[PDB]
mmCIF file of N, CA and C in Angstrom:
data_model
loop_
_atom_site.group_PDB
_atom_site.id
_atom_site.type_symbol
_atom_site.label_atom_id
_atom_site.label_comp_id
_atom_site.label_asym_id
_atom_site.label_seq_id
_atom_site.Cartn_x
_atom_site.Cartn_y
_atom_site.Cartn_z
ATOM 1 N N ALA A 577 3.681 -8.997 -25.641
ATOM 2 C CA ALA A 577 2.946 -9.854 -24.704
ATOM 3 C C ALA A 577 2.758 -11.252 -25.277
ATOM 4 N N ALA A 578 2.574 -11.388 -26.583
ATOM 5 C CA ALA A 578 2.444 -12.712 -27.164
ATOM 6 C C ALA A 578 3.719 -13.515 -27.103
ATOM 7 N N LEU A 579 4.838 -12.903 -27.410
ATOM 8 C CA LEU A 579 6.157 -13.535 -27.240
ATOM 9 C C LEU A 579 6.399 -13.948 -25.811
ATOM 10 N N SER A 580 6.054 -13.045 -24.875
ATOM 11 C CA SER A 580 6.267 -13.326 -23.450
ATOM 12 C C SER A 580 5.395 -14.485 -22.983
ATOM 13 N N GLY A 581 4.146 -14.524 -23.440
ATOM 14 C CA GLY A 581 3.267 -15.633 -23.104
ATOM 15 C C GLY A 581 3.738 -16.966 -23.671
ATOM 16 N N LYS A 582 4.236 -16.970 -24.898
ATOM 17 C CA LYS A 582 4.759 -18.200 -25.474
ATOM 18 C C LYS A 582 5.991 -18.702 -24.750
ATOM 19 N N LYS A 583 6.932 -17.801 -24.447
ATOM 20 C CA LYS A 583 8.122 -18.222 -23.721
ATOM 21 C C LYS A 583 7.811 -18.623 -22.286
ATOM 22 N N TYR A 584 6.815 -17.977 -21.696
ATOM 23 C CA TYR A 584 6.456 -18.317 -20.329
ATOM 24 C C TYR A 584 5.755 -19.654 -20.269
ATOM 25 N N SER A 585 4.901 -19.980 -21.239
ATOM 26 C CA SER A 585 4.329 -21.308 -21.311
ATOM 27 C C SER A 585 5.399 -22.334 -21.616
ATOM 28 N N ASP A 586 6.370 -21.998 -22.453
ATOM 29 C CA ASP A 586 7.415 -22.944 -22.806
ATOM 30 C C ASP A 586 8.413 -23.165 -21.690
ATOM 31 N N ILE A 587 8.483 -22.265 -20.709
ATOM 32 C CA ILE A 587 9.262 -22.574 -19.514
ATOM 33 C C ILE A 587 8.403 -23.256 -18.447
ATOM 34 N N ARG A 588 7.091 -23.005 -18.443
ATOM 35 C CA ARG A 588 6.167 -23.677 -17.566
ATOM 36 C C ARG A 588 6.081 -25.162 -17.897
ATOM 37 N N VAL A 589 6.187 -25.515 -19.158
ATOM 38 C CA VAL A 589 6.147 -26.929 -19.540
ATOM 39 C C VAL A 589 7.434 -27.624 -19.126
ATOM 40 N N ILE A 590 8.555 -26.880 -19.030
ATOM 41 C CA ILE A 590 9.766 -27.463 -18.501
ATOM 42 C C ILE A 590 9.653 -27.636 -17.006
ATOM 43 N N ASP A 591 8.954 -26.699 -16.342
ATOM 44 C CA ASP A 591 8.534 -26.965 -14.958
ATOM 45 C C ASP A 591 7.603 -28.138 -14.850
ATOM 46 N N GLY A 592 6.807 -28.382 -15.910
ATOM 47 C CA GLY A 592 5.877 -29.491 -15.946
ATOM 48 C C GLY A 592 6.435 -30.837 -16.348
ATOM 49 N N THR A 593 7.759 -30.984 -16.347
ATOM 50 C CA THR A 593 8.376 -32.271 -16.651
ATOM 51 C C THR A 593 9.117 -32.801 -15.415
ATOM 52 N N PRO A 604 12.364 -33.662 -3.962
ATOM 53 C CA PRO A 604 11.726 -33.952 -5.241
ATOM 54 C C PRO A 604 11.714 -32.749 -6.204
ATOM 55 N N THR A 605 10.877 -32.853 -7.200
ATOM 56 C CA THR A 605 10.748 -31.876 -8.304
ATOM 57 C C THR A 605 9.287 -31.457 -8.447
ATOM 58 N N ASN A 606 8.688 -31.059 -7.328
ATOM 59 C CA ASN A 606 7.253 -30.840 -7.199
ATOM 60 C C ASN A 606 6.803 -29.611 -7.998
ATOM 61 N N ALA A 607 5.494 -29.391 -7.977
ATOM 62 C CA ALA A 607 4.794 -28.513 -8.906
ATOM 63 C C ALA A 607 5.188 -27.062 -8.679
ATOM 64 N N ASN A 608 5.725 -26.421 -9.717
ATOM 65 C CA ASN A 608 6.223 -25.068 -9.615
ATOM 66 C C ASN A 608 5.095 -24.069 -9.807
ATOM 67 N N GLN A 609 5.397 -22.781 -9.768
ATOM 68 C CA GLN A 609 4.363 -21.792 -9.486
ATOM 69 C C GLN A 609 4.289 -20.718 -10.557
ATOM 70 N N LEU A 610 3.090 -20.254 -10.849
ATOM 71 C CA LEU A 610 2.839 -19.100 -11.699
ATOM 72 C C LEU A 610 3.132 -17.812 -10.924
ATOM 73 N N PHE A 611 3.202 -16.687 -11.632
ATOM 74 C CA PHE A 611 3.293 -15.387 -10.949
ATOM 75 C C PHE A 611 2.160 -14.498 -11.460
ATOM 76 N N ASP A 612 2.187 -13.261 -10.999
ATOM 77 C CA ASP A 612 1.187 -12.302 -11.371
ATOM 78 C C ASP A 612 1.422 -11.845 -12.801
ATOM 79 N N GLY A 613 0.910 -12.605 -13.770
ATOM 80 C CA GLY A 613 1.072 -12.275 -15.170
ATOM 81 C C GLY A 613 0.350 -11.014 -15.586
ATOM 82 N N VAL B 529 15.982 -25.190 -5.538
ATOM 83 C CA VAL B 529 15.845 -26.604 -5.266
ATOM 84 C C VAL B 529 16.754 -27.367 -6.201
ATOM 85 N N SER B 530 17.592 -28.219 -5.619
ATOM 86 C CA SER B 530 18.600 -28.948 -6.375
ATOM 87 C C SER B 530 18.662 -30.363 -5.870
ATOM 88 N N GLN B 531 18.986 -31.291 -6.773
ATOM 89 C CA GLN B 531 18.966 -32.710 -6.391
ATOM 90 C C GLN B 531 19.862 -33.521 -7.299
ATOM 91 N N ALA B 532 20.836 -34.181 -6.717
ATOM 92 C CA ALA B 532 21.745 -35.051 -7.459
ATOM 93 C C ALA B 532 21.488 -36.484 -7.047
ATOM 94 N N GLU B 533 21.679 -37.393 -7.985
ATOM 95 C CA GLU B 533 21.611 -38.828 -7.718
ATOM 96 C C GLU B 533 22.837 -39.511 -8.222
ATOM 97 N N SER B 534 23.019 -40.751 -7.751
ATOM 98 C CA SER B 534 24.051 -41.599 -8.297
ATOM 99 C C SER B 534 23.627 -43.040 -8.040
ATOM 100 N N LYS B 535 23.406 -43.821 -9.089
ATOM 101 C CA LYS B 535 22.874 -45.150 -8.930
ATOM 102 C C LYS B 535 23.521 -46.121 -9.896
ATOM 103 N N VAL B 536 23.354 -47.398 -9.609
ATOM 104 C CA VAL B 536 23.572 -48.423 -10.649
ATOM 105 C C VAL B 536 22.463 -48.314 -11.679
ATOM 106 N N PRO B 537 22.787 -48.190 -12.983
ATOM 107 C CA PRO B 537 21.769 -47.757 -13.971
ATOM 108 C C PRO B 537 20.660 -48.765 -14.202
ATOM 109 N N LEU B 538 20.782 -50.014 -13.782
ATOM 110 C CA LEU B 538 19.667 -50.954 -13.929
ATOM 111 C C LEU B 538 18.795 -51.025 -12.696
ATOM 112 N N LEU B 539 19.379 -50.903 -11.511
ATOM 113 C CA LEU B 539 18.714 -51.302 -10.282
ATOM 114 C C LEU B 539 18.059 -50.145 -9.556
ATOM 115 N N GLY B 540 18.557 -48.911 -9.711
ATOM 116 C CA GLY B 540 17.923 -47.774 -9.074
ATOM 117 C C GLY B 540 16.564 -47.432 -9.625
ATOM 118 N N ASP B 541 16.262 -47.880 -10.842
ATOM 119 C CA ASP B 541 15.008 -47.488 -11.499
ATOM 120 C C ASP B 541 13.794 -48.191 -10.935
ATOM 121 N N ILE B 542 13.974 -49.367 -10.371
ATOM 122 C CA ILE B 542 12.853 -50.197 -9.914
ATOM 123 C C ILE B 542 12.215 -49.587 -8.681
ATOM 124 N N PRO B 543 10.938 -49.176 -8.737
ATOM 125 C CA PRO B 543 10.364 -48.417 -7.628
ATOM 126 C C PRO B 543 9.858 -49.289 -6.504
ATOM 127 N N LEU B 544 10.620 -50.295 -6.154
ATOM 128 C CA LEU B 544 10.439 -51.143 -4.975
ATOM 129 C C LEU B 544 11.751 -51.292 -4.208
ATOM 130 N N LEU B 545 12.862 -51.365 -4.917
ATOM 131 C CA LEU B 545 14.180 -51.466 -4.298
ATOM 132 C C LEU B 545 15.096 -50.343 -4.759
ATOM 133 N N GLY B 546 14.535 -49.304 -5.389
ATOM 134 C CA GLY B 546 15.330 -48.210 -5.926
ATOM 135 C C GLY B 546 16.012 -47.395 -4.867
ATOM 136 N N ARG B 547 15.455 -47.376 -3.628
ATOM 137 C CA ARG B 547 16.134 -46.725 -2.541
ATOM 138 C C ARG B 547 17.385 -47.469 -2.138
ATOM 139 N N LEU B 548 17.403 -48.812 -2.287
ATOM 140 C CA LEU B 548 18.519 -49.614 -1.839
ATOM 141 C C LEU B 548 19.713 -49.576 -2.762
ATOM 142 N N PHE B 549 19.715 -48.782 -3.768
ATOM 143 C CA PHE B 549 20.904 -48.717 -4.623
ATOM 144 C C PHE B 549 21.384 -47.304 -4.872
ATOM 145 N N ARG B 550 20.465 -46.336 -4.984
ATOM 146 C CA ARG B 550 20.857 -44.996 -5.374
ATOM 147 C C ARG B 550 21.497 -44.239 -4.223
ATOM 148 N N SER B 551 21.877 -43.016 -4.509
ATOM 149 C CA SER B 551 22.445 -42.113 -3.518
ATOM 150 C C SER B 551 22.008 -40.705 -3.901
ATOM 151 N N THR B 552 21.136 -40.105 -3.072
ATOM 152 C CA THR B 552 20.517 -38.847 -3.432
ATOM 153 C C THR B 552 20.980 -37.759 -2.485
ATOM 154 N N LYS B 553 20.919 -36.526 -2.986
ATOM 155 C CA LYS B 553 21.304 -35.345 -2.232
ATOM 156 C C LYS B 553 20.413 -34.206 -2.706
ATOM 157 N N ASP B 554 19.518 -33.767 -1.820
ATOM 158 C CA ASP B 554 18.573 -32.703 -2.129
ATOM 159 C C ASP B 554 18.955 -31.461 -1.334
ATOM 160 N N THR B 555 18.584 -30.280 -1.898
ATOM 161 C CA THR B 555 18.980 -29.019 -1.309
ATOM 162 C C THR B 555 17.905 -27.990 -1.685
ATOM 163 N N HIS B 556 17.137 -27.554 -0.722
ATOM 164 C CA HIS B 556 16.146 -26.521 -0.929
ATOM 165 C C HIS B 556 16.617 -25.269 -0.198
ATOM 166 N N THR B 557 16.310 -24.083 -0.737
ATOM 167 C CA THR B 557 16.918 -22.857 -0.238
ATOM 168 C C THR B 557 16.024 -21.674 -0.513
ATOM 169 N N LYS B 558 15.669 -20.908 0.493
ATOM 170 C CA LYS B 558 14.899 -19.676 0.296
ATOM 171 C C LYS B 558 15.591 -18.518 0.996
ATOM 172 N N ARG B 559 15.551 -17.350 0.355
ATOM 173 C CA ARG B 559 15.996 -16.135 0.974
ATOM 174 C C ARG B 559 14.984 -15.041 0.595
ATOM 175 N N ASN B 560 14.219 -14.596 1.574
ATOM 176 C CA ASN B 560 13.291 -13.491 1.379
ATOM 177 C C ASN B 560 13.881 -12.251 2.031
ATOM 178 N N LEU B 561 13.691 -11.121 1.371
ATOM 179 C CA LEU B 561 14.370 -9.901 1.788
ATOM 180 C C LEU B 561 13.532 -8.685 1.384
ATOM 181 N N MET B 562 13.204 -7.859 2.358
ATOM 182 C CA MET B 562 12.573 -6.594 2.082
ATOM 183 C C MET B 562 13.333 -5.450 2.746
ATOM 184 N N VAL B 563 13.355 -4.319 2.080
ATOM 185 C CA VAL B 563 13.935 -3.082 2.632
ATOM 186 C C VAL B 563 12.869 -2.014 2.556
ATOM 187 N N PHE B 564 12.348 -1.623 3.702
ATOM 188 C CA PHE B 564 11.312 -0.637 3.904
ATOM 189 C C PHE B 564 11.884 0.664 4.398
ATOM 190 N N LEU B 565 11.066 1.728 4.261
ATOM 191 C CA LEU B 565 11.518 3.057 4.620
ATOM 192 C C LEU B 565 10.355 3.807 5.223
ATOM 193 N N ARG B 566 10.668 4.682 6.159
ATOM 194 C CA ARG B 566 9.637 5.472 6.814
ATOM 195 C C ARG B 566 10.139 6.863 7.063
ATOM 196 N N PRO B 567 9.677 7.850 6.376
ATOM 197 C CA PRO B 567 10.078 9.216 6.694
ATOM 198 C C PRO B 567 9.042 9.928 7.558
ATOM 199 N N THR B 568 9.498 10.751 8.484
ATOM 200 C CA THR B 568 8.611 11.615 9.269
ATOM 201 C C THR B 568 9.172 13.042 9.225
ATOM 202 N N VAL B 569 8.359 13.973 8.789
ATOM 203 C CA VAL B 569 8.753 15.370 8.685
ATOM 204 C C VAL B 569 8.424 16.077 9.981
ATOM 205 N N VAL B 570 9.420 16.669 10.616
ATOM 206 C CA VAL B 570 9.231 17.540 11.770
ATOM 207 C C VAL B 570 9.767 18.916 11.434
ATOM 208 N N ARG B 571 8.963 19.925 11.683
ATOM 209 C CA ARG B 571 9.366 21.297 11.466
ATOM 210 C C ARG B 571 9.170 22.199 12.670
ATOM 211 N N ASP B 572 8.320 21.809 13.622
ATOM 212 C CA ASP B 572 8.262 22.482 14.937
ATOM 213 C C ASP B 572 8.858 21.543 15.975
ATOM 214 N N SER B 573 9.293 22.168 17.062
ATOM 215 C CA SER B 573 9.915 21.389 18.138
ATOM 216 C C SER B 573 8.942 20.535 18.934
ATOM 217 N N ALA B 574 7.628 20.758 18.756
ATOM 218 C CA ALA B 574 6.651 19.940 19.474
ATOM 219 C C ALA B 574 6.649 18.512 18.997
ATOM 220 N N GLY B 575 6.632 18.309 17.674
ATOM 221 C CA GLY B 575 6.667 16.967 17.142
ATOM 222 C C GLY B 575 7.987 16.258 17.389
ATOM 223 N N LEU B 576 9.076 17.011 17.397
ATOM 224 C CA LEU B 576 10.369 16.467 17.751
ATOM 225 C C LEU B 576 10.422 16.030 19.209
#
């Protein structure tokens, strides 16, 4: 779960860089 | 969602005339799909 959370945040920040705001899922 | 551009590298950046030089192509695409199932058991001829 810790690895998954780190990789998921690290892909969310790539979503955080039209190209409008992308979405979370049911974590 | 996909988007390509093509611009003169100095003039497309200016956010007042940047539309007048670049060339953009956007493409958004969704496909939603569900497959549902419904069984009904009949064993007497009344329900059939």
